Amino acid sequence: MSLSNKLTLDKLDVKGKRVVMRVDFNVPMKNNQITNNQRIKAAVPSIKFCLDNGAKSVVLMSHLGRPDGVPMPDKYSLEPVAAELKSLLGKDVLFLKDCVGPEVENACANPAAGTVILLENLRFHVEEEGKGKDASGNKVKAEPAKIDAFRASLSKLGDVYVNDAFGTAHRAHSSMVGVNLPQKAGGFLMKKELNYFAKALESPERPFLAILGGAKVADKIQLINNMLDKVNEMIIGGGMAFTFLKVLNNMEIGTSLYDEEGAKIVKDLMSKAEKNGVKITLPVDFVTADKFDENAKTGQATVASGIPAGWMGLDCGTESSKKYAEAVGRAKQIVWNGPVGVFEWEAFARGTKSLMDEVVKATSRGCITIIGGGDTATDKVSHVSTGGGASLELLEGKVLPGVDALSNV
Ligand SMILES: COc1cc2nc(N3CCN(C(=O)[C@H]4CCCO4)CC3)nc(N)c2cc1OC
Known part of the structure; x- marks a missing residue:
């Protein structure tokens, strides 16, 4: 790589x-x-x-x-x-x-x-x-x-x-x-980016934890699939998680993001995880909102209680942050791609801020930490990528045409 x-x-x-x-x-x-x-x-x-x-x-x-x-x-x-x-x-x-x-x-x-x-x-x-x-x-x-x-x-x-x-x-x-x-x-x-992703994907220090956030699931099926063959643990957060929660845990998710195409393969993904001994950490609680708005009324829900009356989850809760923090605690290598909440809005940023805190801490005690820049969160980590679409390709196991076009030695 x-x-x-x-x-x-x-x-x-x-x-x-x-x-x-x-x-x-x-x-x-x-x-x-x-x-x-x-x-x-x-x-x-x-x-x-x-x-x-x-x-x-x-x-x-x-x-x-x-x-x-x-x-x-x-x-x-x-x-x-x-x-x-x-x-x-x-x-x-x-x-x-x-x-x-x-x-x-x-x-x-x-x-x-x-x-x-x-x-x-x-x-x-x-x-x-x-x-x-x-x-x-x-x-x-x-x-x-x-x-x-x-x-x-x-x-x-x-x-x-x-x-x-x-x-x-x-x-x-x-x-x-x-x-x-x-x-x-x-x-x-180009050299630095490829060294960090190659280390993580080909030769990581273990436990290797992927933190995958974002919104849609359908377009990340290949990513998740490839990562399940490389990681020891995986956090699946953000808007993505509700599809897994509804399908796997019978959760009532309200009007939260749901990927109908994604839902069809969720069990396949989890079977693969279990066979590979990969520990999956999904959120267990949520910050809810009555509308998709920066200034919406907010509430709190867990997987067990469900998200109520036409409400939606826009961040993970306080207990999810603990679960995430434990996984980060166990990691020697971390790749974080995709946000775990709608952190542009302060009422839904807490999940992201706590997690970044945990990832910064881990770096200080020698964890190799690779985060995306921009969409993932808001220099105390090992490597902040300048390439979001490009790193996604690498994470999916694809070739970079810009890299192939270069002269061999
Ligand atoms: C929990 O983390 C996330 C949840 C997200 N949810 C959403 N949506 C956007 C689509 N939604 C809607 O259109 C509203 C409006 C009435 C139907 O629900 C609500 C759910 N979008 C997102 N972009 C979300 C992103 C998230 O984290 C990155």
């Missing part, structure tokens, strides 16, 4: 060379204001490395949002990201208003030593994804010749290629799998 077999940046000579580098700068924004810069900071070590080892230039390219192959510079520009990178680098970032074409190529052909360039959003061109939508919202497909010419343009921007875009590594997009340079190395973020 690791990058052990692939060319990496640490064994790539960059002195005197232009580095074209694909990063995941697809950060959360609001009114063209960045609201979480973790993805930017995470790329800094590879960038600083290139600079400190004499790279003539570092050309950065990324997508942002899903403009679907039409320029939306007033909604999805990376310009704000150039300013943020400058502050983090403590160095000028030259921002270009496009990512391919004669002007961008001229700009990148032979820059003054040490220049850092950020290109404009790759997805302003339908050739990045290979498909998209026209200006009228009709789906469109990119044309092979134009995809080729798009790729050839990007490839002209450097002498060697580094992909540090772990967050995008599940996407076989042009900048990810289509750069035609002989040396294609993974950066430090």
Whole structure:
């Protein structure tokens, strides 16, 4: 699973060379204001490395949002990201208003030593994804010749290629799998992410506990299945749990999330767990709400009492947190993916906060702790992933096209 077999940046000579580098700068924004810069900071070590080892230039390219192959510079520009990178680098970032074409190529052909360039959003061109939508919202497909010419343009921007875009590594997009340079190395973020997930999934310290939260079950059946073959314990929490509780324990769940497709395979999953000796910890109590709202009336219920009158469970309860904390207590390795409550809303955040507390504690006493960033919870853990969709693929046992496209050693 690791990058052990692939060319990496640490064994790539960059002195005197232009580095074209694909990063995941697809950060959360609001009114063209960045609201979480973790993805930017995470790329800094590879960038600083290139600079400190004499790279003539570092050309950065990324997508942002899903403009679907039409320029939306007033909604999805990376310009704000150039300013943020400058502050983090403590160095000028030259921002270009496009990512391919004669002007961008001229700009990148032979820059003054040490220049850092950020290109404009790759997805302003339908050739990045290979498909998209026209200006009228009709789906469109990119044309092979134009995809080729798009790729050839990007490839002209450097002498060697580094992909540090772990967050995008599940996407076989042009900048990810289509750069035609002989040396294609993974950066430090790509390497670090893959080392942590490879350790956890191939060679974990045991007991190995997976904490799987989130909402829907149907789309996580493969994930759960694969994890049941690797873990010793598994917490199944968040909206997902109600499907298991209704099916396995006859629980009355009110209007709580229920996955009819998921319910059909629940017993199969649990049979697999029991055969494998995996201890499953589901919630035993809940914070309830009379409506799906931040300011709903709240209540408390257990599995035994049921969730009442059209009410829904939006967080686990105090006793669930204890069960979770015991499982965390027993873990030497933890992978946490998906939230266990609706923690954006403070009345339903307690479950998540207690659990993060337990996971931070475990780290302090030597537990290897891997959490997702963003959807899972709100640097006192071993590894916070920058890739949610991408890590999900890894957890399901799938291949990362961004990783396969790299040169072997
Ligand atoms: C217990 O943890 C969770 C519960 C979640 N529940 C929900 N829903 C969303 C769908 N729901 C509704 O539409 C309401 C409105 C009347 C029917 O119930 C209620 C349940 N959604 C979610 N996104 C939930 C997420 C959760 O944790 C991550």
